[PDB]
């Protein structure tokens, strides 16, 4: 409920970020999550492995591409 709505706010936030920065490592996206926690605190418990698994669902669903150690959005 809280976690889920805020994870949606985070995804929207990250897509905008990727659109502008082109690509992002897992580690930089994690640093972005930790800053975002202040805005939506229901994400406070998410750790690096859980974030990775969340991003991997997006890769399986072809909403992100993963290569060269970085995540990218499909070209639009």
């Amino acid at each position: 409920d809280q976690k889920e709505e805020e994870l949606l706010l985070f995804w929207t936030y990250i897509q905008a970020m990727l659109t502008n920065l082109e690509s992002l490592s897992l580690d930089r996206i994690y640093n972005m999550l930790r800053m975002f926690v202040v805005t939506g605190p229901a994400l406070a418990e998410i750790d690096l492995q859980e974030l990775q698994g969340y991003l991997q669902k997006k890769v399986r669903d072809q909403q992100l591409v993963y290569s060269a150690g970085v995540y990218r959005l499909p070209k639009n």
Binding site: D1, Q2, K3, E4, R34, V37, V38, P41, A42, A44, E45
Partner: protein, 73 residues
């Protein structure tokens, strides 16, 4: 029983509590440890912000659980 409160600096403080303690009272014990006023504290567990009137046992928080503290202005 023992619980842990992790702040955004990565600092982990440890608390002596009972299952019957309110979230209000947990925030009073955080205040005693860090000087943070209770009204500024948001405590996070199982994807929720914890309500002051409710108890740890109301949220099924067992010993050794970690709460996450995120402060507001």
């Amino acid at each position: 029983m023992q619980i842990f409160v992790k702040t955004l600096t990565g600092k982990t403080i440890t608390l002596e509590v009972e299952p019957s303690d309110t979230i209000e009272n947990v925030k009073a014990k955080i205040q005693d440890k860090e000087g943070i006023p209770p009204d500024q504290q948001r405590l996070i567990f199982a994807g929720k912000q914890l309500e002051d009137g409710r108890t740890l046992s109301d949220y099924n928080i067992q010993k050794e659980s970690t709460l996450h503290l995120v402060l507001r202005l």
